[PDB]
Structure 1
């Protein structure tokens, strides 16, 4: 009996994403319902929140300086949340050598988290477009910012983020959901919002971890569009040490985000399938996997040996990488739900 539910749960667990992926690939066929406008030239405020990133901060403001967006339409706000290792002290060094780039560095009381810093920065922002970008993120081309901005021209588009590149099943979901209506996941490498909507929201909330995705999703719910077009590209920043902990800090942010998002309001009809499927994939399906694993483990230790064959196959499939990064993602999600439940105390 426990092999029965193990294979049922395995079927349900792997079938949910594959069916969703097929519906995404049919969304991917339709043409964009909005167009980037290359002559659109709004005032743009780029906000870099920093706590202890000195090597990265000098590479980062180099990266923003090198953007080809008209410098009279651009300003940077760097927010240090009262960090120790003298990154503000590097920041005005870079500001000494680059005076023609409009810059305001703003220092905090002490660290109250990223969203709170973003709201402080927001009361300095003067642009029509507000771009959040993490300090460890580098834009690979001198037109990355301009490309995001072209996509913000349409009045229905409220937010744009990048696709990440060097299983790009992920990127398919991103731009398919983008074309359908909105994608509920944004990337901190580049998150661009129309400031009028941030003011209506108002600001970023301090209780969700995935600031970008939460704002993007709130803008989608408001009847605006939140998209990651394929030509707005950033390279993912990988931390190095503590990779699993970092990936689990991000799973936990996605789990908090989707948990709060589906307990609020009604999505525009084209968005409610998107929201519910991605909330399912982040909050439900991961549990099906290790429950099946344990039922097979019990059936193996006591009695049956088709069960133990299924687990041994499971390992032999741990050799090839797509299945590896899938089951490890499910692992991060389950760990995250656990740490989420026990952290609030």
Structure 2
């Protein structure tokens, strides 16, 4: 019967870690911000949207940036296109000469060579003090969304700002709790704003990692600046109708490469290192304890024991209610991402 002992030891550890961390986070949550948004701060802001073959979306995405209340003499846009099959380079022609008051630069590259490459080339054509990366399929819900992000960037100790997303609450609690504590290691491509002096100290975006936003936010946090997601900077998540599981596995893959690379580098500030280590644990270690318990159980169930068999009937019964199946399937995505990571590089 020792397989039941190991099975629910692993299940106790796996489900206990995230709720000990959440409890710790909630503690941090009622502590007030040691930084303040400044509404009269007006830096020059460059919005960079990297695009490869999204001629449908680009029209209204530029429309969404255009309709922001942030003052246009301090706003410019760089649509960076990596040699696209579609007619996007001058889909941005179209729009760009139809909205002339909005300073825009379409820079196009020799070659398609990935997201970070496009961002780096766009970076040295950017003139703003704040660089905001955003995905072409992401739309900002309010006309003051960009201004809300920028107001959080005023304090000299804040190097990076991202949004909280809407369509779990557990996730958003982690985000703004870690942000209050010091920094959060996960940013969102819907709105990722960095101080350009810091980007060019880094310098530019590294090609090694998929989660460019969260890797750059994390490296700004290791350097001693704040990387934060304030609750009033809210984006809505862009979920594609088809290929959903593949997409979620792909973003998990970016997350596990990011955290695997980030824990490798040592000099983390005292407030940040528990944050870094806890979310690196949750992303690289805990997922594994789940399906190992499941296999321990199945083997035991097959070889006679019925308690385990019930343990797994209970597990299926807990799949009916939605917080359990959100959690389980994200652990599944994380395991898929780990194996896909190991075998993608060969």
Q: What's the TM-score, normalizing by structure 1? A: 0.99
Provide Cα deviations, 1:90-138, integer angstroms capped at 9, x if missing partner: 1111112100100000111121000000000001010000000000000
Aligned residue pairs total 345
Note the C-alpha offset of 1:223. 0.3
3-state DSSP of counterpart to 1:97? coil
3-state DSSP of counterpart to 2:291? helix
3-state DSSP of counterpart to 1:216? helix
Instruction: Report the counterpart of residue 70 of structure 1 in structure 2.
Output: 71
The 2-side partners of 1:15 and 1:86 are apart by 51
Q: Any stretches of 5+ residues in structure 2 without a counterpart?
A: none
The 2-side partners of 1:327 and 1:86 are apart by 41
Note the C-alpha offset of 1:87. 1.3
Note the C-alpha offset of 1:211. 0.1
Q: What's the TM-score, normalizing by structure 2? A: 0.99
The 2-side partners of 1:239 and 1:194 are apart by 30
The 2-side partners of 1:229 and 1:287 are apart by 32
The 1-side partners of 2:70 and 2:168 are apart by 33
Provide Cα deviations, 1:239-277, integer angstroms capped at 9, x if missing partner: 111000000010000000000000002211000000000
Note the C-alpha offset of 1:88. 1.5
3-state DSSP of counterpart to 1:79? strand
What is the RMSD of the two structures over their aligned residues, measured on CA atoms?
0.5
Note the C-alpha offset of 1:233. 0.5
Provide Cα deviations, 1:125-157, integer angstroms capped at 9, x if missing partner: 100000000000000000000000000000000
Instruction: Report the counterpart of residue 84 of structure 2 in structure 1.
Output: 83
The 2-side partners of 1:109 and 1:228 are apart by 35
Note the C-alpha offset of 1:207. 0.8
The 1-side partners of 2:94 and 2:316 are apart by 52
Note the C-alpha offset of 1:167. 2.5
Note the C-alpha offset of 1:59. 1.1
Note the C-alpha offset of 1:89. 2.4
Note the C-alpha offset of 1:85. 1.3
Instruction: Report the counterpart of residue 211 of structure 2 in structure 1.
Output: 210
3-state DSSP of counterpart to 2:264? coil
Provide Cα deviations, 1:224-250, integer angstroms capped at 9, x if missing partner: 000000000000000111000000010
Instruction: Report the counterpart of residue 237 of structure 2 in structure 1.
Output: 236
Provide Cα deviations, 1:185-215, integer angstroms capped at 9, x if missing partner: 0000000000000010000000100000000
Note the C-alpha offset of 1:336. 0.2
Note the C-alpha offset of 1:54. 1.2
The 1-side partners of 2:273 and 2:76 are apart by 36
Provide Cα deviations, 1:16-61, integer angstroms capped at 9, x if missing partner: 0000000000000100000000000000000000001111111100
The 2-side partners of 1:243 and 1:36 are apart by 36
3-state DSSP of counterpart to 2:227? strand
3-state DSSP of counterpart to 1:9? helix
The 2-side partners of 1:140 and 1:222 are apart by 32
The 2-side partners of 1:292 and 1:92 are apart by 56
The 2-side partners of 1:266 and 1:107 are apart by 37
Matched, 1:325 2:294: no
Instruction: Report the counterpart of residue 288 of structure 1 in structure 2.
Output: 289
3-state DSSP of counterpart to 2:104? strand
Matched, 1:12 2:13: yes
